[PDB]
Paper text:
The bromodomain and extra-terminal (BET) family of proteins, including BRD2, BRD3, BRD4, and BRDT, are chromatin reader proteins that bind via tandem bromodomains to acetylated lysines in histone N-terminal tails. BET proteins recruit co-activator complexes to chromatin to promote transcription of target genes. BRD4 regulates a number of genes essential for cell growth through the recruitment and maintenance of the pTEFb complex at gene promoters during mitosis. Chromatin readers bind to specific modifications on histone tails, translating the histone “code” into transcriptional effects by recruiting co-activator or co-repressor complexes to target genes.
Herein, we report the results of our studies using GSK1324726A (I-BET726), a novel, potent, and selective small molecule inhibitor of BET proteins. I-BET726 is a novel small molecule inhibitor that binds to the acetyl-lysine recognition pocket of BET family proteins. It binds with high affinity to BRD2 (IC50= 41 nM), BRD3 (IC50= 31 nM), and BRD4 (IC50= 22 nM), and competes with tetra-acetylated histone H4 peptides (K5ac, K8ac, K12ac, K16ac) for binding to the bromodomains of these proteins. I-BET726 is highly selective for BET family proteins, exhibiting no binding affinity for any bromodomain-containing homolog tested with the exception of CREBBP, for which I-BET726 binds with >1000-fold lower affinity than to BET family proteins. To determine if MYCN suppression is due to direct regulation of the MYCN locus by BET proteins, we analyzed recruitment of BRD4 to the MYCN promoter by chromatin immunoprecipitation (ChIP). BRD4 was specifically enriched at the MYCN promoter relative to IgG control ChIP in vehicle-treated samples, but not at an intergenic region on chromosome 12. Treatment with I-BET726 diminished BRD4 binding at the MYCN promoter in both non-amplified and MYCN-amplified cell lines, indicating that direct regulation by I-BET726 remains intact upon gene amplification. Taken together, these data demonstrate that I-BET726 directly modulates MYCN transcription by inhibiting BRD4 recruitment, and represses MYCN expression to a high degree regardless of amplification status. BCL2 down-regulation was previously observed with the BET inhibitor I-BET151, which displaced BET proteins from the BCL2 transcriptional start site in MLL-fusion leukemia cell lines. Consistent with these observations, we detected BRD4 enrichment at the BCL2 promoter in the SK–N–SH cell line, and treatment with I-BET726 abrogated this interaction. Here we show that a novel BET inhibitor, I-BET726, exhibits potent anti-proliferative activity in models of neuroblastoma, a solid tumor associated with a high frequency of MYCN gene amplifications.
Numbering used by the authors: 42 to 168
The structure:
């Protein structure tokens, strides 16, 4: 089977900006999660060819990963923090939906999600 193309990371038809909250999401939140020992499976799109999981993209039609989120932040793709936070949650939700409750990857996602929530709890005021 084949992989789908990755989620778009820059769209010339879609308005772009930077906010101090989106800066915090890249510089503090994503940066902290990216170098966690459990981050690596989430640093790029799920590769259903490499993993030989032809049902992954039958079940998950809105994939998301931290590599995509990082690129989106780098490209000012998000207009606000809520769009970025939603993508992080889509990434976690996809993981919990596809994988079984006791799987290594689920425990890894749960650890990253706990840390994510700790970090976004101090999202700064908009300047
Ligand atoms: C995110 C998610 O739900 N899944 C996922 C995604 C990517 C990779 C993965 C990523 C990169 C490599 C690699 O660089 O070789 C290998 C596997 C693996 C997985 C998950 N598998 C897995 C991850 C970690 C450990 Cl310790 C054991 C099994 C399955 C799942 C589809």
């Amino acid at each position: 089977s084949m992989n789908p193309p990755p989620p778009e990371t820059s769209n010339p038809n879609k308005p772009k900006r930077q906010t101090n909250q989106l800066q915090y999401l890249l510089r503090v939140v994503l940066k902290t999660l990216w170098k966690h020992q459990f981050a690596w499976p989430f640093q790029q799109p799920v590769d259903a060819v490499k993993l030989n999981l032809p049902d992954y993209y039958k079940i998950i039609k809105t994939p998301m990963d931290m590599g995509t989120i990082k690129k989106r932040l780098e490209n000012n793709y998000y207009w606000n923090a809520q769009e970025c936070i939603q993508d992080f949650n889509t990434m976690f939700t996809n993981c919990y939906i596809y994988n079984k409750p006791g799987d290594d990857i689920v425990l890894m996602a749960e650890a990253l999600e706990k840390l994510f929530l700790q970090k976004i709890n101090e999202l700064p005021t908009e300047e």
